[PDB]
């Protein structure tokens, strides 16, 4: 009863947003609270933020 | 009663690194102005960035170009970081055509008088086949901040499916800003200091113009508080 099968592949971008689970390699999993603007981020003596 | 700051030195150690000295400033105003200017710089410096790409013979970014070392996705990522300075227009269409063995760098885009490539040595991609011919149209717009491709949509929301290789636009020309408040050996007072803003950018913006634009933005924002009703 199967005549034709059309398989369609969809590729989607997924970008980091508040809520995604991010972890290191030590069990320190956490959830993205918010995306903090670059100027609000703490910066060291050379102006290089984190 | 207050000694107004003034531009006393703009040292261009490199094309992407500049020290700007403001003098003189009273105690406390140094850090205040430094933080305000650093945040306005990092937040609201306009610039130009690659927005749309249309390579011939390519339907979507999830595909391969013939005789090209890198993926089309990698090519779009490399075009994202292309430092272009545009004078007089907010919407320009560059064309890049190339063929033969060699690294297709930023020096090979068709030259126009209203467009300048800050770094000609920026490697866009590579070609590995003698008959491999690459030809792309790059649309550059003038904007501010970061507008991801997913949020922005076409005006009528209907554009060429084969084209529309949308690249995320990082319009910000500045990448790092530090500021220091240092004691100045003034022969008139002893409480005066100088504000050294050390800026590292992509080379597409004049530091004096950027600082004046930041000051204009700050003054226009404070005008609402001053003119209160």
Curated annotation (Swiss-Prot), chain A:
Superkingdom to which the source organism belongs: Bacteria
Subunit structure: The RNAP catalytic core consists of 2 alpha, 1 beta, 1 beta' and 1 omega subunit. When a sigma factor is associated with the core the holoenzyme is formed, which can initiate transcription.
Function, as annotated: DNA-dependent RNA polymerase catalyzes the transcription of DNA into RNA using the four ribonucleoside triphosphates as substrates.
Family: Belongs to the RNA polymerase beta chain family.
The protein's name: DNA-directed RNA polymerase subunit beta
Lineage: Bacteria, Pseudomonadati, Pseudomonadota, Gammaproteobacteria, Enterobacterales
Gene: rpoB
Stretch of the intact protein here: 1045 to 1094 of 1342
